[PDB]
Structure formats: C-alpha cells, structure tokens
Amino acid sequence: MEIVEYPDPILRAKNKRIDIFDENLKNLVDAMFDVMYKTDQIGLSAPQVGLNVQLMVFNPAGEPGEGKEIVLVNPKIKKYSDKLVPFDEGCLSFPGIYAEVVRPQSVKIDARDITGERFSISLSRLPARIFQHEYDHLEGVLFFDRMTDQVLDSIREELEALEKKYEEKTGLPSPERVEAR
Ligand SMILES: [Zn+2]
Ligand SMILES: [Zn+2]
Ligand SMILES: [Zn+2]
Ligand SMILES: [Zn+2]
Ligand SMILES: [Zn+2]
Ligand SMILES: [Zn+2]
C-alpha cells in the first residue's frame, strides 16, 4: 500500500462510484483504515491510496479504539454551514506542507455504509474539517485550491519542489503546475 502525493494524476481524476458492496469493498475499507491509523489520520479517501473511487474511511477520534469507525461510500455533502473558519490545514499528499484554509464550520452528509445502506450525519469542529478535506479529494480538489492567493504564494515553492519530484521520479512532465494559478 502507498499514499499518492502531489502532483500524481490519480489525486485529480474522476472517482467512480461504487455498487458492489462485497467481501472486497470491506477488505479495502479495512486496509484503508489501518493506513489511516498508521498515519495518525482522522479520515482518508481512496484516491489518496491509489484507487480512484467514491470511498471514505473516517473516525472522529482519529485514534485506535476511540470514536467510531465510519465508512462513507459515495458521500455527498447536503449542507455546508454559513459560519466558516480558519485552520492551519495539512495533507498526506503534501508532506510537511501546512498553510491556512477557510472551510464551513459544520456539514450535513449522506452516504452509504459498507452494506450500501443510506445514512446521514452531521459534524462540526475538527471532524467536519477533516471530512471536508477528504471530501475534496473524492472530487479531484486539493486543499491549496481552497487557499487565498497570499497563502498559496507562501507554499508555491514547496509545491514546485513536489512537481519537480514527480518529474524526476516518473520521467513525465508534471500533469499540473501551481504556476497555472
Ligand atoms: Zn505498499
Ligand atoms: Zn486490519
Ligand atoms: Zn493521533
Ligand atoms: Zn487525507
Ligand atoms: Zn489531503
Ligand atoms: Zn515557478
């Protein structure tokens, strides 16, 4: 298993809905969770680990045996709150890169469980924050897309280094460039 980093093209690709809720969705949830736990994370999307589909493992507690293990197959945020707030956000795709981002405080979500049953849920504080961050992933959106132009200008060299890293490691031109912004 591996975490895909920017600027890898799977992180921006279209993520396919899931339909076969079977032994293999489960296995995949399991292994996505353990990655989430191995990287001290509170949530983690399928594109991040190389697969381009509509899947999220989550636990608000962000900790082994604390909170609840929730899976969100095909999530869709049905409500974002008017109040929004700052936070020094980070991402497993941009290691070491942290900058400020504004996202709505609380969110209303629908999704399907590991059995494919349809539930709802609301969140606030850090869990709605980590949930929005992983939700953008499912949508080919990376958190700097959500940064003002001054905040982004602050991490610009750290992104170009990643870009450069992907070019060196794959022999291909970077699929996208933060200069484009
Ligand atoms: Zn591996
Ligand atoms: Zn396991
Ligand atoms: Zn922790
Ligand atoms: Zn993540
Ligand atoms: Zn991320
Ligand atoms: Zn440049």
Author numbering: 1 to 181
Give verbatim excerpts from the published study on this entry.
Here, we explore the precise structural inhibitory mechanism of actinonin, which is a slow, tight-binding inhibitor of peptide deformylase (PDF), a metal cation-dependent enzyme. PDF is the first enzyme in the N-terminal methionine excision pathway, an essential and ubiquitous process that contributes to the diversity of N-terminal amino acids.
In this respect, site-directed mutagenesis of AtPDF was performed on Gly41, Ile42, and Ile130. In the case of G41Q, the structure of the apo-protein did not show any modifications compared to the WT structure and remained in an O conformation (“O” zone).
